[PDB]
């Protein structure tokens, strides 16, 4: 596909919606805010809307390389703060994916340029879980690191001042850690779901334990 | 929709693909890299794949509040550098949208919290184009600011060291500035398309002139 | 000077303080917090303590290339928020300097690498004030840009959510914009001093007017 | 001290230099670049020039809360890249300090606001070294964490793409990790000095071993 194809396809799709789904934009024109924030990877191998059935307007989205929530990344933190404090999303889903190019590059460590600095945060997680990974068969280690990465980003998200403040004041927000692969598109819930500061810690340990 | 609904819908969708599109993941399993990078807004009012017909695996994606390319945002710059230098995408599309909550908040300036710092970059663009906006009817000013924001982010992207280096070395990368609204989902090409350092400047001025 | 010289000089200086100034560390050992935050340039051509006579413990310090307060730089914003909310500094001084290598590189635009992205924020200010600079003799333009840069960083600092919140709640914090050169080390007050949201705007315009 | 005092002291100091040290600015007026980059804490309890005897023009400086080199902090990375690639500094010194308010806040974890996000990077280091710290007497743990923080920031600096590139191309740059306290101002060399990729790893382990 080329650029002229995208523009032309868009024009035809917009016209065909009049017959196929004349109401396609009706919920978007209402003041209903999205209830979900999705933090995923720029690889976007299967779009979040396809994976879940979520409709236009139901999902606020951030994507970056390897779906990180770095403690001091103001881009992601600004998405989160707007979603939690202004849109009042009820769920935040961090979704990783098996085969992620960012996770693979963190492990193989090729000299890729500027991106290698971003990927050092993944190498820190790999270091953190070296003993756990060493108890597992080698062929499962890379996908396990993909899962651990998600769990650590959920943990970071729950430790941000944004989430700590929301939970302290009794706002209902739940964080989830998921992963999928392109072998079937099937979401795996990594079982780290957090609804407050206490469950954040308990279920982080639970998710890691399920891997041990 | 609730969380159990998303998980259950995903499981049913994955199973139904066997009959509907057993080859759905086949291109994803190949080593073909995406040819397009989409930088859009976290509002994600209509997903980029729906707007354009792009299939899974064809698009690398970054989203942040109001689709900014801030000169010093390492999150977006890391997506861009990986896309340009490692994946060798041929097109980068920055897409804004009429009615964007981030653009509207920049103009109305409510006290929203942390996000207001991010939005100051939009207020700088609004200031930059005050005289242009003053020559236009008031009712068209907010959507014109949405377009100017896209054009300025294209300009910032082309001035990044990543893009300047790629163009200097003769890598073929084209940057585009688009917008759409939810009244019809129809993409408007803002006509700032840049294939090198010279067209970046020429077509930036062209796009602004088309508004004057 | 070499590394062994620094270590050896430090050991001799520490010993000599017993006779010269046995009380040198006494105020540092007290709980008195610094009353001033200095945001300056990494060039650090004359140290802030030498310029002003401020003693150890009186100054909290941030330095970066060309003394910027970028709207979305969490490093500088974190220094500011800790200084304002935790240390309760009463004064923030942004100090630029004539001959700054960062300002000069923004104007000459050599291909320096990663730093060029940071310097684009200065090029934006240069663009903003093109008409003002054009009314002045060429030989004064670079130093005038140095001053305008300081004034714009003061303006950015006052527009941060940190400062807006502090002023809204009645905390006494004053922001100042200064510059000096190495021809005499003499500080010039650029006359943009702000004690609240209103004086921020009034004195920003005043400082610019003093240049016109 | 108040603001009028600083301005007045500066004017008197500038005049008195004519008799005391008429050549004070002479090296600054030459094209000699600084040979040292100092990365220190915004606490700046004893200024680096006082600790070492370094003269004006000999030191390029960055300061942030708790002297961090975060993998993805473009402010510090931009200082480093300009210092290494443009100024060609020969030494980078990361200096922490015993009693640092940032390190103490990471351990005590008060609710301080925005700064808590920055401090999570220190809490990650505290977690990393929990077993080491547990083998030591409690009263020495906080200062040991101050030292470990410096060592980890040296390690991060050496793993940045900036430093890896410089060492790969044979540029002579040495990184050092130091600390001091206000009980005597005496620098402690933490013995993690790195001149290439190999010594970075060897001396990181050496410095940690010296603590065990
Ligand atoms: Zn990925
Ligand atoms: Zn938007
Ligand atoms: Zn400077
Ligand atoms: Zn400190």
Author numbering:
A (entry chain A), B (entry chain A), C (entry chain A), D (entry chain A): 2 to 213
Authors' text:
Here, we report a case of persistent CA2 contamination that crystallized in three forms. Two are new crystal forms and the third yielded a high-resolution (1.43 Å) structure of a common CA2 crystal form. The coordinate bond lengths, as seen in the high-resolution structure, are Zn—SG(Cys42) at 2.2 Å (range 2.2–2.2 Å), Zn—OD2(Asp44) at 2.1 Å (range 1.9–2.1 Å), Zn—NE2(His98) at 2.1 Å (range 2.0–2.1 Å) and Zn—SG(Cys101) at 2.3 Å (range 2.2–2.3 Å), with the ranges reflecting observations from all models reported in this study. Sometimes, as was the case for the data sets resulting from CA2 crystal forms 4 and 5, there is no match for the cell and symmetry in the PDB. The fortuitous discovery of a CA2 crystal in the previously characterized form 2 from the same protein sample revealed the contaminant. We present a high-quality carbonic anhydrase 2 structure that may serve as a new standard for structural studies.
